[PDB]
Amino acid sequence: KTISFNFNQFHQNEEQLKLQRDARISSNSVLELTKVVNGVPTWNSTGRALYAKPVQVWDSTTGNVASFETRFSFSIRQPFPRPHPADGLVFFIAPPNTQTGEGGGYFGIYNPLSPYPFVAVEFDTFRNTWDPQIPHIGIDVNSVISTKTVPFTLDNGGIANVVIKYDASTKILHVVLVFPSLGTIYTIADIVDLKQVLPESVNVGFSAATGDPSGKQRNATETHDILSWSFSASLPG
Amino acid sequence: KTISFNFNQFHQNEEQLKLQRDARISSNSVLELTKVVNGVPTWNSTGRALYAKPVQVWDSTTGNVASFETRFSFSIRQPFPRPHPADGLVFFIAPPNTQTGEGGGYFGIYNPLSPYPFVAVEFDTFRNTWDPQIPHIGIDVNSVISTKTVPFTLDNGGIANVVIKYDASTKILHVVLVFPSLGTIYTIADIVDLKQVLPESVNVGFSAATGDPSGKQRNATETHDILSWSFSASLPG
Numbered sequence: 001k002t003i004s005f006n007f008n009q010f011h012q013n014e015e016q017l018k019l020q021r022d023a024r025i026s027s028n029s030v031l032e033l034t035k036v037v038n039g040v041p042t043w044n045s046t047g048r049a050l051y052a053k054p055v056q057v058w059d060s061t062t063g064n065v066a067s068f069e070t071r072f073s074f075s076i077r078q079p080f081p082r083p084h085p086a087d088g089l090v091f092f093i094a095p096p097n098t099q100t101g102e103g104g105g106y107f108g109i110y111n112p113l114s115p116y117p118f119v120a121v122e123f124d125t126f127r128n129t130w131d132p133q134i135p136h137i138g139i140d141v142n143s144v145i146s147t148k149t150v151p152f153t154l155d156n157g158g159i160a161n162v163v164i165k166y167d168a169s170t171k172i173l174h175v176v177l178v179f180p181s182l183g184t185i186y187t188i189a190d191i192v193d194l195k196q197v198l199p200e201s202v203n204v205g206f207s208a209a210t211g212d213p214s215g216k217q218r219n220a221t222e223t224h225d226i227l228s229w230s231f232s233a234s235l236p237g
Numbered sequence: 238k239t240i241s242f243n244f245n246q247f248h249q250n251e252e253q254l255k256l257q258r259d260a261r262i263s264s265n266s267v268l269e270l271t272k273v274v275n276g277v278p279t280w281n282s283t284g285r286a287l288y289a290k291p292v293q294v295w296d297s298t299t300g301n302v303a304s305f306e307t308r309f310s311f312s313i314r315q316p317f318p319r320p321h322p323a324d325g326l327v328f329f330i331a332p333p334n335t336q337t338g339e340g341g342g343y344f345g346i347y348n349p350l351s352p353y354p355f356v357a358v359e360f361d362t363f364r365n366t367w368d369p370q371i372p373h374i375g376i377d378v379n380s381v382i383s384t385k386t387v388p389f390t391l392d393n394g395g396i397a398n399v400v401i402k403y404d405a406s407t408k409i410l411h412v413v414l415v416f417p418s419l420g421t422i423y424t425i426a427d428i429v430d431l432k433q434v435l436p437e438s439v440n441v442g443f444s445a446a447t448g449d450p451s452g453k454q455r456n457a458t459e460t461h462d463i464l465s466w467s468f469s470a471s472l473p474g
């Protein structure tokens with residue numbers, strides 16, 4: 001089976017998408033994961049967007065695990081340079097029927113008081129105690145304490161292109177981040193066996209968070225917009 | 238609501254119980270959680286016994302959480318005093334349809350690669366890197382790194398009586414361990430809010446494991462028998 005879908009731009013009322021929390025689709029065809037009021041991003045926000053149908057990542061019957069490729073472009077604009085923007089966005093795969101986890105440095109996917117399995121790639125903008133120098137991309141398996149990290153220099157307000165490919169044969173998850181206006185290229189990879197971590201069917205989508213009010217700094221925010229998104233996966237057996 | 242059950246001793250073919258892995262009920266009416274062949278407890282063992290029907294620990298419509306009490310007697314016999322007996326047993330509450338996680342110091346409940354929520358009381362006999370002096374009673378919330386612990390001196394081969402009470406009105410989980418032959422009393426308590434951790438309906442039961450072959454020490458074993466077990470829960474709403 002080969003599932004595929006492509007969004008060159010999002011539209012309002014889109015059937016194949018499931019918005020959660022603050023996430024909404026603007027008139028301009030941009031998916032804003034977090035809250036922006038008349039051009040200014042707000043703190044204390046969290047939002048997610050999921051493809052409305054689950055995809056089969058592997059089969060128990062055959063033991064085969066699906067390969068997949070996903071591509072998307074995003075934009076993170078940081079208006080208040082000081083004291084520190086927050087928190088970041090992530091592409092994630094998690095079991096179906098899940099609710100938004102905690103925000104902040106958890107991105108709306110990780111809840112320490114009610115854990116569930118998840119694999120996710122993060123573009124992190126705030127340096128928590130469990131984090132290395134920001135910004136950095138990170139591969140996360142069940143936790144926000146990344147297995148692998150690589151720092152990057154954000155194109156503030158610019159466009160970022162991302163390619164994430166998973167090869168069943170090698171169990172390699174490889175991630176590409178490009179900032180076209182800047183010419184910069186960032187690469188990061190790790191072995192992840194989707195079978196020992198996730199159930200047969202999952203949900204794919206994005207999650208983002210802006211500073212938590214418990215920080216007392218309202219200038220800890222930024223936008224987390226998605227411009228386009230396509231996904232393809234193949235399960236032989 | 239008020240579910241209630243009691244086992245003075247276990248009878249083979251017990252319909253209200255649900256054994257998993259190595260766990261089994263012997264002729265003498267004892268429920269042996271881990272493997273013992275002709276009186277000799279063997280390493281590399283993991284077993285679980287769960288009550289057949291799921292209990293409702295809380296209500297979303299009303300917001301009411303249940304109070305419960307459970308009492309049981311166990312026996313841990315350590316035939317090989319050296320190099321070190323292992324690993325222990327636990328009473329635990331987890332989401333329905335759970336699967337026997339990792340053995341060893343994870344007691345057949347925790348599974349790092351595929352987390353799920355659980356609340357448990359362990360009686361730990363092996364000192365892992367995350368553990369303090371053994372043996373000790375410990376309260377576990379979603380992980381084997383206890384929130385609160387207390388040490389105890391085991392009556393090797395003897396009978397232990399345990400009382401576990403949860404008061405919804407205060408979220409106090411209180412634990413009592415008595416070794417009758419010795420006259421010793423160990424007590425431990427912590428604040429635990431079942432609503433922030435578990436779903437409305439869970440499964441209640443026991444789990445135990447003997448040393449893992451990864452330690453390369455066949456002597457890291459002991460018995461983990463359950464003599465009797467009563468349980469009462471009351472959900473006002």
Ligand SMILES: *[C@@H]1O[C@H](CO)[C@@H](O)[C@H](O)[C@H]1NC(C)=O
Nearest residue numbers: 022043044045046212213214
């Ligand atoms: C932050 O947002 C959450 C959910 O939208 C709300 O509970 C909270 O009161 C909001 N405001 C502040 C200042 O915390």
Ligand SMILES: *[C@@H]1O[C@H](CO)[C@@H](O)[C@H](O)[C@H]1NC(C)=O
Nearest residue numbers: 259280281282283449450451
């Ligand atoms: C230990 O026991 C398990 C389950 O019975 C088995 O699969 C494994 O190969 C055993 N290994 C050793 C060294 O005993």
Ligand SMILES: *[C@@H]1O[C@H](CO)[C@@H](O)[C@H](O)[C@H]1NC(C)=O
Nearest residue numbers: 316317318319320321454456
């Ligand atoms: C294993 O236990 C037996 C019984 O006490 C003992 O004779 C043997 O040499 C022990 N092995 C170690 C490493 O202590």
Ligand SMILES: *[C@H]1O[C@H](CO)[C@@H](O)[C@H](O)[C@H]1NC(C)=O
Nearest residue numbers: 079080081082083217218219
């Ligand atoms: C926050 O952002 C505004 C807008 O840039 C700036 O004038 C202010 O002093 C910044 N610093 C803090 C600590 O809020």
Ligand SMILES: [Ca+2]
Nearest residue numbers: 105124126128
């Ligand atoms: Ca962070």
Ligand SMILES: [Ca+2]
Nearest residue numbers: 342363364365
């Ligand atoms: Ca231990």
Ligand SMILES: [Mn+2]
Nearest residue numbers: 124131138144
């Ligand atoms: Mn991070």
Ligand SMILES: [Mn+2]
Nearest residue numbers: 359361368375
């Ligand atoms: Mn312990």
